[PDB]
Design a protein around this ligand. Sequence first.
Ligand SMILES: CN(C)c1cccc2c(S(=O)(=O)N[C@@H](CCCNC(=N)N)C(=O)O)cccc12
Ligand SMILES: CN(C)c1cccc2c(S(=O)(=O)N[C@@H](CCCNC(=N)N)C(=O)O)cccc12
Ligand SMILES: CCCCCCCCCCCCCC(=O)O
Ligand SMILES: CCCCCCCCCCCCCC(=O)O
Length: 582
Amino acid sequence: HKSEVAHRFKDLGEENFKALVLIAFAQYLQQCPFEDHVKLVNEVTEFAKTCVADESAENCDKSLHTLFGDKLCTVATLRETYGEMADCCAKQEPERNECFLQHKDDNPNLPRLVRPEVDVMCTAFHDNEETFLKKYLYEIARRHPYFYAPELLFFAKRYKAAFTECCQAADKAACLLPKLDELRDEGKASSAKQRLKCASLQKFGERAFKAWAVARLSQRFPKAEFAEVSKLVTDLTKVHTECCHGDLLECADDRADLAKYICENQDSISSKLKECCEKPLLEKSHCIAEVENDEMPADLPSLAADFVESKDVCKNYAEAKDVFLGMFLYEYARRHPDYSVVLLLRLAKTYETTLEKCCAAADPHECYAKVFDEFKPLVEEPQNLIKQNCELFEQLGEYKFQNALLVRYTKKVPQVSTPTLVEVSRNLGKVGSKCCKHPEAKRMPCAEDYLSVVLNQLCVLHEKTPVSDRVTKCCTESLVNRRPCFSALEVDETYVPKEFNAETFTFHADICTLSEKEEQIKKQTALVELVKHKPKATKEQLKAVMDDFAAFVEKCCKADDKETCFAEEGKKLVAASQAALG
Ligand SMILES: CN(C)c1cccc2c(S(=O)(=O)N[C@@H](CCCNC(=N)N)C(=O)O)cccc12
Ligand SMILES: CN(C)c1cccc2c(S(=O)(=O)N[C@@H](CCCNC(=N)N)C(=O)O)cccc12
Ligand SMILES: CCCCCCCCCCCCCC(=O)O
Ligand SMILES: CCCCCCCCCCCCCC(=O)O
């Protein structure tokens, strides 16, 4: 109303307000120390309480961007510490805010945040819960200037919970550690997905984004009408554009509106928004965005009616190509919550191509009549890979399943670095253990979501150090063809094996004391290097060495004079193996 800070203060609450202001400042002034930001927060909070009291008090009328900018320009060491950015303070709003956005460092040169010992961690938490959580909130926020603030706040509260439950536990570590690792990945995944959607919106444009949304929104709100889905898709697009531009406030307002709009028309969108809509202003958005798919209508016509038979296909299609295709997408997506969004896009793409070729032919109907048949092979491809890979994972464990993927890809792309291969394969394996446990109907969507992030990470590392044209093709290809492209890679015939290296296969007793995580990465690293040396080795030849090795270790780690065993038997292993693998 009259006062913006007052309004936000009232909605959000004191605690949330103070946390968000902190995150916001940490995201711009990434270089200032924790104690400086805390001061800022206090002053902004105090000022806020002043306005809550008297809406007409000094400055309370000024907009949030203006207020935020002024306080930002208050920092005396602004130029000394941030140089160029200080020139932003000379500009008027909105150039000022705009200027600040352009100077936000997407990834500064800060030190990796290390995880302390669980005990020091639980004691710090206990002795000063607030400064312990806020300082870490600060460290995370400054390292991820683009992470949507409210969401970072959502994570914080889960972290708080993990410490309460675990620092009380008998075995604190057994409780805490795994919850922490889970929190980290979930954080890594959210981060990666946010930057991924933004990248895509930049490269492939609005249209492509819109398409992806119709599909996703349709699977989620199958009982909504195409007109509502269009509405939502338009607003969602605006939201992402702005949220991607990086302006927290604008992004927040857009999201608030959309969430409240959805809740008001809740009855005509989805029957699973009841809970989400009764939640606090700060959680509405987050909830809705993650809502389970609603139940789809039972009395739903067959597609071929309006899209294959009907002689108005080309008529309706030429009258508004994108709308018609959007309708096709809507119709197909809502009957298939079990398809990955990108699979749906491939079908829509296929349908479009057909109509382009066909509607330009004498007898349209005859030309495009056998299209739903062209879909079959498209749908089955992803399904087959799922059942096939999920079975294999059920046999061997995650670990053993990770090794198979290790051999499989080292062969396809031997140029890639051994460490990169180990990491990608490990994360790929995890997708197997996180998705294969769901009933079929949810597998593909799961794989898509986890595969998309892992594939982007893969492409990035490669952007930096290009090592293969094939990998770069897949990486730059259509986002809808990214995964298929990687799936179509075959063994590298050209590759010339790395010259043998003794050190690379020498193992010491230190291997017996390392943690599982460590031992595995140690073994998996030799494996990639093994394959990189003998790429023509068969499943049989390999399993042989591995079995020998397997024993080797266990044997030399349960016998006196370790380092002797590994050195004496080690020579034997390598000697025999070099021979078996000719
Ligand atoms: C919940 N969310 C916001 C996160 C919590 C903790 C760590 C996160 C990280 S992380 O990078 O610190 N943690 C990962 C990635 C290593 C990258 N390190 C860099 N210095 N770049 C890790 O420790 O294996 C990234 C993204 C989100 C995170
Ligand atoms: C709450 N309003 C404003 C929404 C915001 C963002 C995404 C929404 C979606 S969605 O389908 O795009 N939801 C996305 C994930 C949301 C982003 N989540 C993050 N943690 N970053 C998806 O399922 O692929 C559906 C409905 C409402 C949404
Ligand atoms: C009005 C609704 C807009 C939806 C537009 C339908 C376009 C679907 C065709 C599929 C295109 C695949 C996406 C791409 O890679 O370009
Ligand atoms: C030509 C040198 C061959 C010797 C190298 C042996 C390295 C193989 C690594 C074994 C990894 C199998 C994983 C496991 O033991 O569970």
